[PDB]
């Protein structure tokens, strides 16, 4: 592998970060010594590995640990915890009974517990009963957050004494997933395959803890041959309201080596912004998430109603919605109002079976004309000559003349009420004939004839004449 190095004593601080207690002390570059905790109460100091570890390759950890100058009976505590978890390179475990492993998720490793915790918290299960007041080295199951000691791995160790450094070797087989830890003559072996659940890259922490009891806890001549894990960029494609719209695109690569992400073209959506990490960058030991936000594409549909008689817009409806959704708009309601008001529908290009908003705009038109109802009014001009005696009694039947009929069209607008009259056409003529008055036997008439009356119009008034007959 290319991502595969050996961390030398002289470069300890390059690859390890002094946290809590340890950050008060400078790595002595003559002894190659790093203080985790001093001989003081309520301490908590760790070294977190800056990178991560490929938990599928072969790593060999070498060094000497000073567990202090006091046993538990003599007021000595708490021990040295080795942490392996899949989480952040900066997350470290709870102190005391959790021994630098408990209270992280997906956590496992090896402790030298120089203090027997018999009373269990929510962060650690009681230490094994077969070790009451006795120092021991053990593997721990920290997956469910609660550090549980593997009672199989529980072998006794030499009490902390005179601040003496004992040899420590932790070796791991990638394919077997088997860890071999040797602390000064005692030897441990455990199958961590159960503990590297799926994630071939784990965070590393060496931690130390004091409480009421205390011990100077240090590390010396550290040698860590391992395969540096690869960084992992994650890329999400989501709408504005969180909901994912495209498959998340998890890449992976050597750290400080370019990663590149891609804006996805997404049917029904336009890119808005990239929240989280840069779309272009370099790879990093913790997991960088580039989200891609998209807007739900909205389509436009308008329906214009036009009075063709005025050539002017009656009303316009504007529908906007998501590319694919139904407007649930009908023209019949807005047509009804108009056809009620005395409009006649000319044309409707709006689809009968509803519309669907699309990426491209939709425009529909409804032409209505002011309804025109052609009527026909008829007028008639009449000539009636009555033939009477001086008493007002009838000498003869009234002559009712061939009537002069007139007719004009009357176009009526049902929207305005306006009446468009045509020209008063004459059906029968303009001239009333001459009417010679009857000759009654033994009478003489005041008018012997009624003269022809011409130039009668539809405006002309009915003629009402009267012939009076005198005796002899
Ligand atoms: Ca303990």
Q: What is the DSSP string of 390-402?
A: TTS-EEEEEEE--
**Cα–ligand 1 centroid distance for 48 (angstroms):** 21
**Cα–ligand 1 centroid distance for 79 (angstroms):** 8
Taking domain 373-471, whether its CATH number is 2.60.40.4300 is answered by yes
Pairwise CA distance, residues 277 & 114, whole Å? 43
Cβ-proximal residues to 85 (8 Å cutoff; 6+ apart), any chain: 91, 93, 104, 105, 106, 107, 108, 142, 202, 203, 205
3-state secondary structure of 417: coil
**Cα–ligand 1 centroid distance for 113 (angstroms):** 5
**Cα–ligand 1 centroid distance for 115 (angstroms):** 5
Sign of the C-alpha dihedral computed for residues 304, 306, 312 and 313 taken in this order: negative
Single out the residue of 140, 286, 281, 299 nearest to residue 202, CA to CA.
286
**Cα–ligand 1 centroid distance for 128 (angstroms):** 9
The HSE-up count of residue 138 (CA atoms within 13 Å, CB side) is: 28
**Cα–ligand 1 centroid distance for 141 (angstroms):** 14
**Cα–ligand 1 centroid distance for 46 (angstroms):** 17
**Cα–ligand 1 centroid distance for 454 (angstroms):** 138
Pick the CATH number of 233-296 from 3.10.20.320, 3.40.50.720, 3.10.20.600, 3.60.21.10: 3.10.20.320
Q: Which residues are annotated as a binding site?
A: 113, 115, 117, 127
Pairwise CA distance, residues 232 & 250, whole Å? 7
3-state secondary structure of 276: strand
**Cα–ligand 1 centroid distance for 9 (angstroms):** 29
Do 47 and 17 form a contact (C-beta atoms < 8 A)?
A: yes
- Domain residue spans of the chain: 4-227, 233-296, 298-370, 373-471
The structure was resolved experimentally with X-ray
Do 169 and 187 form a contact (C-beta atoms < 8 A)?
A: no
Single out the residue of 335, 365, 334, 333 nearest to residue 348, CA to CA.
365
**Cα–ligand 1 centroid distance for 62 (angstroms):** 24
Reduced 3-state DSSP string for 16-56: EEEEEHHHHCCCECCCCEEEEECCCCCCEEEEEECCCEECC
**Cα–ligand 1 centroid distance for 127 (angstroms):** 6
Single out the residue of 214, 264, 255 nearest to residue 72, CA to CA.
214
Residues pairing with 269 in the sheet = 266, 296
Gaps in the chain following residue numbers (C to N > 2.5 A): none
Q: How far is Cα of residue 413 from the mean position of the Cα atoms in its chain?
A: 54
Taking domain 298-370, whether its CATH number is 3.10.20.470 is answered by yes
Domains 233-296 and 298-370 fall in the same CATH topology: yes
Do 230 and 285 form a contact (C-beta atoms < 8 A)?
A: no
Single out the residue of 194, 143, 137 nearest to residue 169, CA to CA.
137
Single out the residue of 280, 279, 296 nearest to residue 242, CA to CA.
296
Instruction: Classify residue 164 by its DSSP letter.
Output: P
Tokens at residue 251, please? Answer: 């890449």
End-to-end CA distance of the chain: 155
**Cα–ligand 1 centroid distance for 116 (angstroms):** 4
**Cα–ligand 1 centroid distance for 110 (angstroms):** 12
Pick the CATH number of 4-227 from 3.10.580.10, 3.30.1520.10, 2.60.120.200, 3.30.1330.60: 2.60.120.200
Cβ-proximal residues to 30 (8 Å cutoff; 6+ apart), any chain: none
Q: Which residues are annotated as a binding site for Ca(2+)?
A: 113, 115, 117, 127
Resolution (A): 2.5
Do 116 and 133 form a contact (C-beta atoms < 8 A)?
A: yes
Pairwise CA distance, residues 150 & 295, whole Å? 52
């Amino acid at each position: 592998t290319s991502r595969d190095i050996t961390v030398y004593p002289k470069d300890f601080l390059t690859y390890f970060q002094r946290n809590g207690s340890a950050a008060g002390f400078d790595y002595d570059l003559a002894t190659y010594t790093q203080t985790l905790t001093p001989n003081k109460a309520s301490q908590a100091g760790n070294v977190t590995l800056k990178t991560k570890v490929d938990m599928s390759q072969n790593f060999t950890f070498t060094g000497k640990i000073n567990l202090g100058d006091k046993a538990q009976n003599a007021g000595g505590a708490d021990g040295v915890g080795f942490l392996f978890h899949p989480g952040d390179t900066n997350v470290v475990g709870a102190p005391g009974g959790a021994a630098g492993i408990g209270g992280v998720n997906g956590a496992f490793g090896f402790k030298l517990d120089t203090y027997y915790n018999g009373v269990g918290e929510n962060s650690f299960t009681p230490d094994p009963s077969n070790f009451k007041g006795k120092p021991f080295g053990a593997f721990v199951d920290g997956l469910n957050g609660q550090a549980k000691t593997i009672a199989s791995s529980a072998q006794s160790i030499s009490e902390p004494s005179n601040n003496n450094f004992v040899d420590f070797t932790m070796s791991y087989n990638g394919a077997t997933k088997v860890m071999s830890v040797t602390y000064g003559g005692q030897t441990w072996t455990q199958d961590v395959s159960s503990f590297v659940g799926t994630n071939q890259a784990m965070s590393f922490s060496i931690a130390a803890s004091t409480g009421a009891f205390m011990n100077l806890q240090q590390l010396r001549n550290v040698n860590f041959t391992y395969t540096v894990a690869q960084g992992t960029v994650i890329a999400n494609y989501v709408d504005e309201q969180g909901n994912t719209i495209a498959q998340q695109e998890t890449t992976s690569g050597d750290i400080d080596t370019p990663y590149v992400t891609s804006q996805k073209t997404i049917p029904g959506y336009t890119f808005k912004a990239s929240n989280g990490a840069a779309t272009s960058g370099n790879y990093a030991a913790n997991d960088q998430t580039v989200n891609y936000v998209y807007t739900r594409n909205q389509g436009s549909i308008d329906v214009t109603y036009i009075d063709q008689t005025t050539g002017q817009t009656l009303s316009k409806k504007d529908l906007s919605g998501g590319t694919g959704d139904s407007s649930n708009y009908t023209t019949t309601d807005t047509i009804k109002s108009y056809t009620d008001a005395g409009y006649e529908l000319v044309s409707d290009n709006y689809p009968s079976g509803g519309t669907v908003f699309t990426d491209t705009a939709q425009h529909y038109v409804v032409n209505l004309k002011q309804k025109l109802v052609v009527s026909s009014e008829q007028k008639q001009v009449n000539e009636t000559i009555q033939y009477v005696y001086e008493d007002g009694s009838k000498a003869a039947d009234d002559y009712n003349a061939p009537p002069l009929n007139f007719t004009r069209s009357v176009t009526t607008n049902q929207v305005t009420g306006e009446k468009t009259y045509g020209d008063w056409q004459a059906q029968n003529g303009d001239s009333f004939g001459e009417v010679v008055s009857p000759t009654i036997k033994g009478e003489t008439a005041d008018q012997l004839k009624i003269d022809a009356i011409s130039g009668i119009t539809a405006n002309s008034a009915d003629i009402q004449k009267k012939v009076v007959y005198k005796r002899n």
